[PDB]
């Protein structure tokens, strides 16, 4: 028909796709990243009918990574939408990554029709089984009338407690099945994650422990960024005058330019601290397990975590603070108003930290200042860091490209750096940047990737161009994974294409491409890329043997 | 000979495991020995751990979680490779559903033989993982202190659950240098957390506003060891309360504020419910019609934030430890005058429904005619229940009627089929209670079908001098009897002489068919210094009192 | 009243399930009823299926796979949701390891309550899947014929194994129109495959060239119903053979060509081994040193291609059905004159070691001391075992010594702990053998520990009038007795236990034996008693098996 409003239309019935779209919108899902196909086309269409922003990606890998980044950036679970069978299996990448990083996510996976189960149906798969080991919550929606219930429970399970991934299986007959409107049971709106507080004796014992320590170190993790505790943490550091270290994605909770940051003397600080205060940060590989040879064997630990089971992993916790980061630091701030202790302005600990920071700055100064071409990493970031706005979102991915950018690119706002994370994952790059451009379109999004990392997700540049996302992709091409290689005899397994013109990919989709080989070219290329009104790629050819500055300890062992 | 030089520099995995378990507070180990866990049980006893050898790993895995509940620390179930671990999956699943801690130590075939078809080779970690909070294989003996500490912590901290350690034969017998073994920290008490002060005040204001309030006291408060705080809270507020099946005893059952005798009316008519460590699962009928008002307001105290607002939204969420939060509530109550008034229409309706149900079952309690009904039988059982006894209840009618006729006056003093509705926990639970609290009498009241699942464990009780008192209510079938016959699927043996099983292992056996025999038989069984079975032949068609709603649907 | 108008156009899930099960040849259902499977058991009886109500789901699941092995068709285990299913995982795992078919039907909570914390809500398909060849939830009652057909076929065809059907409560009670239900085909006999002719001929070439050949008869041949072909093959080739524990009976244990009494020498010295439906797992010592020559040539017949060449490479592979391939071997041998010669140095060495092992246990067999040793006990047992009896053996010393002292003359007549070394199969296996073959005697010989795992199923045998004869060898411990305790030893049990009184609790006959003079009259009264019976024998605490060069495990 031409949908003449004069025709009688029954409004009693509603299908599972529409019920799913309404339940999602009610639960605060604003962004849905995916790829359509059988049987989830009606879901994405109904989502747009309710005002949800649908972002069609180029691979389910990037879609599942984008949804957890968007969840991290908004504070509520956002959705990944994938087709049955291989759609879900490609999306297991996001679930595993979200599980390891304690980020929420909602994977909506279509399934083949229930009535054809056992028959070898198109894309028939045991989807709940496969997803369950990676999920905090996984279930199949068996009938469309239960959809509000299942969406409510899946969002609550992903968001409350230690966050994780939720998976909802949607069979075809459920997506298309219809039920009476009045017969659909309502579901309550999931609110904010419940915050819990620590007992008072633990709050006072924490402050008691801090006073006794000669060389105390506060470690700020991305659990404080997730808890939205930046104000409380900045008040605590300002009030106590304690030295602090930020984790990779903990950067920005405290501003990177804060004078109390031991960032430039990280190895010395971990080695010589007699007491560590863990704020939303695990003693996993990223903090070298809290054990020798990176820490003192007798290091005392105050540990603030939402997960009671994490307390005392690897290295025992003297003072355990189990609860919400924002709430517990608020408790600490209120107890410090009854006390008057602060960490003194002049101690040997402060002197050793300042001297080591200056030594590390003096060690990288010649590399930052060296204008020879092909350029090293520190020289390239000199021009990048000079042009990064104070409110930018930075996505970093690679090995040397990522690790050197971690120290050369400051963050001043929390939740403004997205990188390989606790799983050390390549492939999150353009997925994370697309999520950052959809969640905060008023802020510049700059992705700085190595040449290898770009190849995992570089095709999502089309997605950015398709939705008018002015994402700035900067590629540091040394021609290999972690390091370049000469022309050979077969090629090295770590070898790629040092002469690749990755910037031409931008021209395929209507973006701007720039190619940098000499130091004099870098400045004008970056300025034009930031000023170009759309997505851009800047492909920088760096020295094949460029490396990070030498450290006493390898980052891994 | 002590004059012979003997190298003391090395220690094997079985000894490291026993030392690590003793350090983390494991005092009881239930299992069945065999390849390759024999040295583990031997090493455990040398460290002072009490080892109890059962007759089936099913009962062993149930005993381990029962003792964990009673002691407040994870206790051990030790089983052999292959079918040992698969037999023990029953207990892991039950522990997961009840949120009880548990440490299963499972032997495994030697790692050097993986893929060859070794004796009892199995993917044991993979099988157990979906039923556990924690599951891992110990790959090298030097890691044992680390893994024992992490498993005990994972099972005990937060929402408790099952932890599993896979112990290959080469790790059990593998030796390492004693000085090279890295020590682990001792897992302390479970961390407690509190609610925000705003939430404490919102909870108290909501209690003041309600016209028909009801406190529901769950076994989570028994696990939290929060009985003192709960009794102060109920005594301070004068609020009516309902105890869940194993929440019984947190408040004494004879307390004047209990709505136990008017449970259906209390849930149906309340306008506000205060859930204390209780879930809106099937046991509480999901907090939804037809058993509740569609507009019921909910204050929900739970340690798990993901459980908040399941099935029925919570108006006030109190996320944290039960004892700590009720402690906060008691403190905030010390600055208010409010208490629930002594005279309200809500109290009078509760009292009239209690008196109604009492008159309904009074003729069955007093009826001395034989074959007896359930209420007449429990009239003599209840009269001889010591107040410090640990009561194990198991069956359908036998358990459900025992739940109302057998009061508890202390917490953690009733063990029953639980949140999983499990038959087969009876003697395993009773064995665990007798090992943990040998100074307390242990009475298991089972139906005749329930006794069939684990009845062989009576030999375990006798072998260890555990004076467990097993009382069997024998109607001749599952849930109900049946006339003489193919036989009905639910039918069993109405004439079975189960008490003769006691006489097979030195216990005392008593057979009762008449009401005049019940009193003297219970007294002779209670007095006997050893285990005892009282087999009672009840009426085939005896049943529970009529109700408006079926317990399930 | 039949005069009342009754609508007969609808049928529910439990009835569809019963008709589907009976259509697919399910004759026996072992379970324990309760929510939500009560209608399924009642419906099964209406279609003539024999329902046996057990006392624990553990035994129920072991019973179902034993009946599948004896009947050649998957039989049912029926369990309630939640812990019923979790208790039955033991049988699935044991059926998987032994390659025996089995159909587990598990009730489930109603689908419409999923996620709510319903009574006995559980991820039952997820838990059972690693142990099953086939595991699915029946989502709608109209699908029941389809799923039953697919599950029985998946459990029975190819390498057999367990199948699991999850039956939610709203599917059990749900109704469908009679004429709307889609029919399902009847699963027939398992497909048999043959070997290429060049493999048949090369296998025969290998046999001729061997100086010390050995044929190993495994329970794969028993499951394939290949006893006729195997007997014709050993009789035609005159080859020495060794039967596995449950391969016993495929060839009569009294055949002159059995090397059973010289087992270690036959494996150690054979230059060529012909595996007939037997794996080189722990039971055959992996086919490797120190139990075999390092250069041992292997011919391997197995239905599973992936099994071929495990641990020890096979010189000739025969992938197919046991009955079918041995038929090819017998056919090809009719165009050959070769047979293994009547007199060989290999034959004399086998004879000598048998004679030496016979003389090694002969004094223990004849020793009339009380407390008795194991061999003395079995002298009276074996002298009273009917030739058509079904033997169930379970324990450590009790089972291993019963293996050599109780011959089997027919196949599929011995049921024991199997490839998984499982305790707890005893009375479930005996109940299944009594239900399936009620005209045949069923004798279960268990140790004291093993009887404690399933002893309560004696009430099941008494309730269904199954004349199972339970002989318990009580040494007062697990594998060995123990002196009185000071904490009791972990392996210790009750040497003075009167296990036979359990029989008197359920109407059976109980007998107690301590002296050797009492053993004879007690066994004769137990066999003559018209019903189940327990013979409790207090054996010596330190009695052990014949000394061997190698330990059974390592
Ligand atoms: C294939 O397979 S690959 C696997 C994929 N790969 C990844 O997933 C990489 C993930 N890895 C990480 O996440 C980090 O690697 C860790 C694990 C957290 C360790 O951290 P990190 O050891 O790398 O420390 P960070 O990067 O912060 O800094 C390095 C050195 O630069 C000094 N420094 C910092 N800032 C300044 C400054 N502004 N000026 C001068 N010096 C500075 C600082 O003091 C330190 O020097 P040090 O103190 O050790 O002498
Ligand atoms: C297969 O397949 S199957 C076997 C599986 N099965 C299980 O796993 C059992 C699990 N099931 C339960 O856990 C309970 O079933 C629930 C779910 C908690 C419901 O609870 P419940 O509805 O049964 O209530 P409760 O047991 O407390 O008492 C019953 C009636 O006795 C009244 N009453 C209480 N105390 C007294 C007293 N002292 N004197 C006189 N009357 C009393 C009370 O008031 C109520 O009567 P009402 O108020 O409804 O008229
Ligand atoms: C904890 O956890 S633990 C409990 C767990 N445990 C189980 O799950 C038991 C599983 N174990 C087995 O399945 C078997 O154990 C194997 C692995 C197949 C090895 O088998 P097997 O090495 O034990 O050999 P078999 O039992 O056949 O016979 C023994 C010796 O008796 C000789 N022999 C045979 N027949 C006669 C006769 N009629 N007269 C005189 N001697 C005879 C024969 O020749 C051999 O003597 P040998 O030749 O070695 O000197
Ligand atoms: C390839 C790879 C990297 C690229 C370094 O090369 P790239 O050009 O991106 O940066 P460079 O160091 O400046 O050369 S890192 C890394 O861990 N990894 C292994 C790796 C591969 N795949 C996935 C999913 N996660 C990974 N973690
Ligand atoms: C058999 C069985 C019961 C016995 C009632 O019969 P019993 O004689 O013990 O008590 P009665 O009511 O006085 O006659 S209850 C029940 O749920 N059930 C099913 C059931 C079976 N197996 C497992 C593991 N869990 C279960 N839950
Ligand atoms: C207890 C036990 C056995 C009894 C030997 O003692 P029993 O009195 O039955 O026989 P005895 O040797 O004549 O004294 S064997 C064994 O492997 N095992 C460990 C064992 C335990 N649990 C399971 C499920 N499977 C097992 N396999
Ligand atoms: N609201 C919250 N309050 C406190 N801690 C939290 C909260 N949410 C998550 N966490 C914890 O923060 C920790 C983050 O650790 P990790 O991912 O290792 O951070 P990083 O990698 O920055 O060190 C997790 O262990 C998680 O349990
Ligand atoms: N220390 C604690 N404080 C408060 N609640 C707890 C604690 N430990 C466990 N819980 C919670 O108590 C609840 C027990 O509820 P449930 O087992 O349903 O009780 P019942 O069976 O008596 O209704 C679980 O949801 C669990 O998360
Ligand atoms: N019809 C059949 N024909 C041939 N082999 C079969 C058949 N069915 C099963 N099998 C095989 O028989 C083998 C049984 O070996 P196993 O259980 O090790 O027996 P045993 O313990 O007697 O050695 C399995 O590998 C299985 O694949
Ligand atoms: Mg590179
Ligand atoms: Mg009964
Ligand atoms: Mg024994």
Residue numbers in the entry:
A (entry chain C): -5 to 482, 486 to 554
B (entry chain B): -2 to 482, 487 to 554
C (entry chain A): -2 to 482, 486 to 554
From the paper:
Originally identified in the mammalian α-oxidation pathway of 3-methyl-branched fatty acids, HACL/S has demonstrated remarkable catalytic reversibility, as it is capable of condensing fCoA with various substrates covering a wide range of aldehydes and ketones with different carbon chain lengths. All the enzymes are tetramers, specifically dimers of dimers (α2), where α2 dimer represents a catalytical unit. The three domains have specific functions: the N-terminal domain binds the pyrimidine of ThDP (PYR), the middle domain has a regulatory function (R) and binds ADP, and the C-terminal domain binds the pyrophosphoryl group (PP) of ThDP.
The structure of ApbHACL/S with L-lCoA shows a partly ordered acyl with a clearly visible sulfur atom. ApbHACL/S yielded the structures with CoA-ThDP and ThDP-hmCoA, as well as complexes with acetaldehyde, fCoA, L-lCoA and D-lCoA. However, in several our structures of ApbHACL/S and TbHACL/S with CoA derivatives we observe states where acyl-CoA is no longer connected to ThDP, as the sulfur-carbon bond (S-C2 in acyl-CoA) is broken. These may correspond to post reaction states. In addition, three structures contain covalent adducts to ThDP (“oxo-ThDP” and “hydroxymethyl-ThDP”). We suggest these “oxo-ThDP” and “hydroxymethyl-ThDP” adducts to be products of off pathway reactions. Based on the kinetic characterization ApbHACL/S, DhcHACL/S and TbHACL/S are the top three variants that showed the highest catalytic efficiency toward acetaldehyde.
